[PDB]
Design a protein around this ligand. Sequence first.
Ligand code: NA
Length: 312
Amino acid sequence: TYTNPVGGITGIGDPYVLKHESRYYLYATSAINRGFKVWESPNLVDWELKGLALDSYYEKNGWGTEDFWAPEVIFYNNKFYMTYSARDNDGHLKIALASSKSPLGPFKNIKAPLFDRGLSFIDAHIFIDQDGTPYIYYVKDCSENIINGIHISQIYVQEMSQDLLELKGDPVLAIQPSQDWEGINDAWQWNEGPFVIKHEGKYYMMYSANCYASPDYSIGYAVAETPLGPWIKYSGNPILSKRMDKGISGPGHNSVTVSPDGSELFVVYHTHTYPDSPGGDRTVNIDRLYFEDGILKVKGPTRSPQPGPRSN
Ligand code: NA
């Protein structure tokens, strides 16, 4: 069995898991002044810290001053590509692209920043469709995005070039705060942390809304017929939300992976380490993710013993 939070990993946020060759690699917001830690597991339950996968102080890097957030790693063209964001010398948060021959690094910058529009961007997520076309989903961050008086984080999407170095065409708005559960009467509003999966020919974008430092941080999804949208939010959002009666606060900024035997999906998400006084100290959790009647569902959030991720 497992009991959340799995691995006892605290002082993090934004857990991204990649499965590769029967091992799992977790990358997270961690060393915020410097880079990103990686943890390894054979089973999604037992985790071992394996150092900085991306270190801005590594001799081949050097980019970014602070605010190293939300790394994601894909295996594409027979190597590993990491996206992340950090604050540049000009004060704007920007997305960067790095690569490595190994999931444990060292990752080396290949285009840092990946793009630059004089504004703040975070939470890049690269989705490779079944036909091999890459798409990047990313956040135009509330810090520098004010629309009709609201500081608002919006998720955009663009198709990428095959080499991942260019974002094609104009940015396409995917989603922005719009549903009642997303704090649409607040001065600051968020849709962030996109993660896209495909199921039965449709595309499902999981995302987080409300403030990361509130118990009300929570996960919803939207559905599209094509990766560039239109993206239509699930009416029953959020699909993963707090259970303060279980000490579960602010479930958010998730990734998705599969069990060791390939038979079932898990959502990997953070919650506040200290629900009595929430903030940036978050911890890693997993729970079962599945589709039923065309609805994406989570069995959770749990904090009691659950059957281990299915394995042979
Ligand atoms: Na992410």
